[PDB]
Design an enzyme around this catalytic site. Structure first.
Site, PDB file in Angstrom:
ATOM      1  N   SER A  47      58.899  16.610  25.834  1.00  0.00           N
ATOM      2  CA  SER A  47      57.700  16.555  25.031  1.00  0.00           C
ATOM      3  C   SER A  47      57.743  15.516  23.912  1.00  0.00           C
ATOM      4  O   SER A  47      56.725  15.285  23.254  1.00  0.00           O
ATOM      5  CB  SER A  47      57.415  17.963  24.446  1.00  0.00           C
TER       6      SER A  47
ATOM      7  N   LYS B 243      57.237  12.440  15.839  1.00  0.00           N
ATOM      8  CA  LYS B 243      56.563  13.271  16.818  1.00  0.00           C
ATOM      9  C   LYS B 243      55.411  14.030  16.176  1.00  0.00           C
ATOM     10  O   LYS B 243      55.519  14.524  15.053  1.00  0.00           O
ATOM     11  CB  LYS B 243      57.563  14.246  17.436  1.00  0.00           C
TER      12      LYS B 243
ATOM     13  N   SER C 122      63.441  18.164  25.626  1.00  0.00           N
ATOM     14  CA  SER C 122      62.322  17.399  25.090  1.00  0.00           C
ATOM     15  C   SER C 122      62.729  16.178  24.268  1.00  0.00           C
ATOM     16  O   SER C 122      61.842  15.430  23.862  1.00  0.00           O
ATOM     17  CB  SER C 122      61.446  18.348  24.279  1.00  0.00           C
TER      18      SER C 122
END
Length: 439
Positions: A151, A76, A175
């Site tokens: 996210s 990420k 997320s």
């Protein structure tokens, strides 16, 4: 996406089927051929990763082996990799270059993993979509008109299209579980504080958010997650005690007093439980020891807003007092104790990850102006925080694993919540649920 798992790739290299440079080059190829319409892998480091794969080949040539030796992955974009940007989607921070590897990256590199780049995120990690002005928007590989989640949306997209076998994301508001659910991959929200957040820093700071949020791995299968957890937990976690669905005690929650669930999501979760019950699991639908989920949603929301604001208030508004904050942490601990008592009578909770499958792209910033279609009717978008609240507020580990598709072909995920520090149990119950559902 019939691609090799991370454990398979490492073993391929360890027996000599392929080199680490070959595996690295195949993942670079898959990204270039596949990522145009998806836009998951928005930060690329291909020259440096190739040199690194060459290095790993020199190691295996010298007898070395490591559980991930030569395996390409991505991470990420909010997790620092030395030499790459960390922006969290802010235009103001697009050229903030991290100086040190994060602790998760250090661990995985030390197990011999190779990082090809990073995957896309929403602005401030504050959405169940991944779109921002530095990199643009990630689209769900199962349906480009729908959100990839957020996210950790890029991570889940990249896994779902078979680009790389392993990823690592972060979860303060669903997320990890929400993108895994929308894109039909596996994501593990880990026990609070079990994995270090060093290097998951607000850009230009060495501060992390020290409540609620965690980091955890993302993959296409439960075995990669278990291994990725063992390699990154700050210390070694309890092994799975479970080894069969026979007698497993399941609490099945398809209703939530603060959020609706689409009939197809409910049906998917219920069918996960009936498969287990058919393998000998005892499934309950209610229990007296279950905490007030409505109170919990509100207590989690109040704390979450304070954390993201970092304790600051708008002007004309007084900040929460330090003393009152301490009082809130006490309320949190009291609710956690409630779950400790529930988990004396239950091995796992089965419930939705979210009340819908991936929704169509939304350009609306404010969540109070979004709706979600649930059984034909518009409902409030924000209400769905309810489903992910239990495990973030109370710290429990929580798996999102694929269990079906809805009528439009969109993945539907099941959430498995187990007791604090039993993360390996949540992974193992998921593997066993996948077996029963094949049955």
């Amino acid at each position: 996406m019939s691609e090799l798992s991370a454990i398979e790739t490492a073993a391929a290299i360890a027996g000599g089927s392929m080199t680490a440079l070959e595996a690295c080059d195949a993942a670079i190829a898959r990204i270039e051929q596949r990522d145009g319409p998806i836009n998951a892998v928005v930060v690329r480091d291909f020259d440096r990763a190739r040199e690194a794969a060459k290095a790993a080949d020199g190691e295996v040539a010298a007898g070395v082996s490591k559980p991930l030796l030569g395996v390409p992955m991505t991470i990420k974009e909010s997790i620092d990799i030395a030499g790459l940007p960390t922006s969290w989607g802010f235009a103001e921070h697009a050229d903030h270059i991290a100086t040190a590897d994060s602790v998760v990256v250090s661990r995985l590199k030390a197990a011999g993993a190779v990082f090809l780049g990073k995957t896309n995120i929403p602005v401030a990690l504050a959405d169940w979509q991944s779109s921002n002005p530095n990199y643009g928007r990630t689209n769900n590989p199962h349906d480009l008109t729908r959100s990839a989640g957020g996210s950790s949306g890029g991570a889940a997209a990249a896994l779902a299209a078979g680009m790389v076998p392993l990823e690592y994301g972060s979860d303060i508001g669903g997320s990890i579980r929400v993108p895994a659910h929308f894109c039909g991959v596996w994501g593990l929200k880990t026990t609070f504080d079990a994995v270090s957040l060093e290097g998951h820093y607000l850009p230009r700071t060495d501060g992390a958010r020290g409540e609620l949020g965690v980091v955890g791995p993302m993959a296409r299968n439960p075995q990669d997650l278990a291994l990725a957890l063992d390699l990154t937990s700050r210390i070694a976690l309890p092994i799975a005690r479970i080894d069969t669905l026979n007698g497993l005690r399941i609490l099945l929650l398809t209703h939530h007093p603060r959020a609706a669930a689409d009939s197809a999501v409910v049906a998917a979760v219920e069918k996960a439980a009936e498969s287990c019950a058919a393998q000998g699991a005892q499934v309950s639908t209610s229990n007296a020891d279950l905490p007030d989920l409505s109170k919990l949603v509100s207590d989690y929301t109040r704390m979450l807003l304070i954390v993201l604001a970092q304790g600051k208030a708008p002007e004309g508004t007084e900040p929460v007092s330090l003393n009152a904050w301490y009082g809130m942490l006490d309320d949190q601990a009291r609710t956690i104790r409630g779950f400790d008592r529930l988990f004396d009578s239950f091995d796992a909770i089965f419930c939705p990850v979210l009340g819908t499958s991936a929704f169509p792209h939304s350009d609306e910033a404010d969540w109070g102006k979004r709706t979600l279609t649930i059984d034909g009717a518009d409902t409030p978008f924000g209400s769905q925080l309810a489903w992910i609240s239990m495990a973030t507020y109370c710290g429990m580990p929580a798996l999102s694993m694929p269990v079906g598709t809805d009528a439009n072909g969109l993945p539907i995920g099941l959430q498995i919540i187990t007791r604090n520090w039993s993360d390996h149990d949540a992974v193992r119950i998921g593997a066993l649920v996948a077996d029963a559902l094949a049955a």
